[PDB]
Amino acid sequence: MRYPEHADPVITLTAGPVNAYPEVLRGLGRTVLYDYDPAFQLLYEKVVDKAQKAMRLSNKPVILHGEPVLGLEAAAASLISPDDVVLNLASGVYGKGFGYWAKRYSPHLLEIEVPYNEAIDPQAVADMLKAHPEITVVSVCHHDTPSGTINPIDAIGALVSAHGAYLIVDAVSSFGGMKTHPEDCKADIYVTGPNKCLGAPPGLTMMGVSERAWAKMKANPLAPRASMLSIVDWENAWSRDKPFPFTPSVSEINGLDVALDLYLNEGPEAVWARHALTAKAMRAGVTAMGLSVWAASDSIASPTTTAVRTPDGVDEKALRQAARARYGVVFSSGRGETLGKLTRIGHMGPTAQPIYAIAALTALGGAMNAAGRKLAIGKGIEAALAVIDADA
Template sequence: MLLPLSVPPLMLTTGPVPVYPEVLKALGAPVLYDYHPTFQEFYAAVVEKLRLAFRTDIAPVIMQGEAILGIEAGAAALIAKDDVVLNLVSGVYGKGFEGWAARYGKEVIELAVPFDEVIDPQAVRDAFRQRPDISVVSLCHHDTPSGTLNPLYEIGAIAAEHGAYLIVDAVSSFGGMDAHPQSAHADIFITSPSKCLGSTPGLSLISVSKRGWEKIERNSDAPRGSFLSLAAWKDASIPGRTFPVTPSIAEIYALDAALDRYAKEGPENVWARHAETAAIARKRLLELGIALWPKREVWCAPTATAFRLPDGFTDVELRDRLLNEYGILLSLGRGDTSGKVLRIAHMGASAQPDFARTTIEALSSILSQSID
């Protein structure tokens, strides 16, 4: 097969990420008819593996589209027209959720911080004190354009104390750290297989709590008979049930392989590998005199490192030199971080300590050449 572009030898982008070899092999399996009993049993087994990975008591759902589908579907299903939504904004994706919250709810209250900071749980408590009618809280756990990590468990506990429903965008955090829906009191928790699980894009992996399903059932405005219908997938993993749409068969094969790999390596070992890789990247960047984008290192995520541009370089120039001279592809910033940062991903197969070392050595060489 002739690819339209050459594949970078070292692709450290924030998604999609390089997939594991097991995933590539699974993609080559024969595509079965989705109502073949063998596939239906296989699909049910994959959903069970995902449930175990999520560490939840309730079967999750798999929607057939990239994770933005899951995020929008979650908002449409859970947020009713009488809901007051507290949208927590510490980055581009947190801000982006505002549109969906406003579309489906009665009112959106924004709690925002500069995009190089994270949400303070005390500020969430204060918001509830000022507005006890808040009924839904929305949080982007790891906002990749900023490389920052919000305190998921602390915020989840506060939302639970006040009886509010919690929607979590865990697209680029789940699988790379301890981030689980039930422990976080998340009522809707969305992630992607194409980040820390090291699989392909094209699916939304969603955990819904028991009370989350109950609220969706009560919400007369929740999509039904629609591609956005989360409820339509609730029992789709029960063999013999009708799929709302034809599943992406090959993507399910890939997810199965990724979940098997995650379980075999051991979640805690996977998280440690991500954390070690990020720590090496941060340490060596600082040694070069390159500043991290987050104001405090403790706010940095273990799944992506965003760093400020060295003097004398534009983001595109530095990205292109890394790619053309060293075969390393990084991500540019997005939205408010565009033109201000480059981002090194540490997700799935790219979360390797040697990759971090190689990247910083290449940066060091480029900086040395600029001085000469």
Template sequence: MLTTGPVPVYPEVLQAMGRPVIYDYHPAFQTYYANVIDKLRLAMRTRLAPVIMQGEAILGIEAAAAALIGKSDIVLNLVSGVYGKGFAAWAARYGKEVVELAVPFDEVIDTEAVRQVLRRRPEITVVSVCHHDTPSGTLNPLAEIGKVVAEHGAYLIVDAVSSFAGLDVHPDAVDADIFITSPSKCLGASPGLSLISVSERAWQKIEANGDAPRGSFLSLLGWKDASEPGRSFPVTPSISEIYGLDAALDRYFSEGAENVWARHAQTAAIMRDGLRQIGVQLWPKREEWCAPTTTAFRVPEGWSDAALRDRLLDDHGILVSLGRGETAGKVLRVGHMGSSAEPSFARAAVKALDEILSNRTST
């Protein structure tokens, strides 16, 4: 299963999720939960304790918009793909105005263009960006964007769902005020949680925002300091998912973060090199824009995306993802995340594609 998420769950994660579910207010679970939060903090390399929301990462992304964006905020939404584009709907729901800086979906955001927009519109208070938009297979220059946004004094919301733990990206290092990721991508766990880092100044803004959700499933504030002794959970935690996240974090630390990143990068490089050798064109215009966690390639002439996807699955047992939105029908996507980030899998995918394209050139 070489899809772009969810990915095949590591065996030790599945085993952990099969443990008995205990009462969430049992002191043993509350201590355990606090330990998981601290492991996540260490993995994210952030000073403040992150929060875990009980739903897949789209919950965290919407919750970030609802909490941080107030009625007077003007949001600069950076768009280089389907998911970046989609954030505008939430930004518009909660803010005063949304300004869009968009590039073609086979390109990445230019940092200087961000700087110029902020100079023209100094009243912009929030900037949002998707680091790695999987339907495009591109990786935006997040650290550079973060510096520009920090210089401007705006708040930065980062969708790092498909990049965190697959490469060297951490919230404090990229000046992110809210940084959302998922256990179901590069950590190799299941898709039931949102993992969110919030900066100190972002918490202050959220607490001052009278429209930020309170007493709601969307409430970031409800989960703030939920791991502290004596604090109550706003809703019942997804206990089995917490077990799985804990095992995934243990595996990440055991392999070593740098080794995990190197494995992802090596797998993607082998995939890209193999595609070049068999004459298949990458979707991003420049290879340096390609993400190490997804390889998106253009559907060869004479084929439909679904037909080629089905041949890979039916003849070779390899499942990949179709494009989405503006990339639908134009690309296929091979995920290199978590347990799928193995060089042998990339070689197998290239070999299968070569056999299919060599034996039949049209559908």
């Protein structure tokens, strides 16, 4: 049998979007209230509170009404002034991408770049900060999703703070899937969203903003105001007694409310543990069947996405097409420089369950063997199962 391209798949095991939690799907269908209805004003405030709790934040996170690219662009536009000296850290497509936004707002850009299967060395950051005491802003990506690798943002954040500089963190594809919070890495702007590990669709940004970041932005006359890019205009919008700069995405708020409930109710530590275990099983299976994990070392592989290096001679696009057509299972391609070079299996929110690693490994192996590889699929499944069983 074959699954047609036009028809829905059986299991979406991508690095996001994945299907939302079923409760979130129902939540998206909640009553759409007028945004100035008192019941909505209360709800919105409560949602900010839940987000604050989930992010372990000492102050209120800002919700912005676009998917997280909005938060990242807004952070650059607001926190980077023309006299700032920015150090951008690039270990993949998103990290490198951010430097282009930094250069938009300040002509002074320094960069540390590593190969797109490696991680930034905190010591290299320290060496750079010593060489360049003029640095005032540092930007880093936690999980550079198209690479499935993780940067040590807490160690990096400690060094940025030691140098009196501001830290911008992209944690879009890590928050909620592993231990990470604005406080942990001493972030001044910490950008995430509910559309990766939290199991909601794309549409909203969740942003931690330090009191020092608030001061800097509010004193910056170039920071966007009366603009979709404005962070400062949303400063007090959490309050039931305050207006919204523009109309909030009411249904997305309903979805986020449920996503936060699910996360908080399950227990963040338990949620992180199942992401890590699913990924660990996946990597063990990949290696056992004769494939290679993309990450330069196991230690930097993401607990929320496994990137698998495309073997020589294998057409990666055809591979994904075959996994879907044969088994109904959808994986992600790479992006930019990693496009065509790897395949990504997400382990995110609803898909962060070890049984999904088993399904993924089988479909990946099956498609690889259809492409003429001679993988030991059974061996891969047993290796993955051994990881699950050893944690039991």
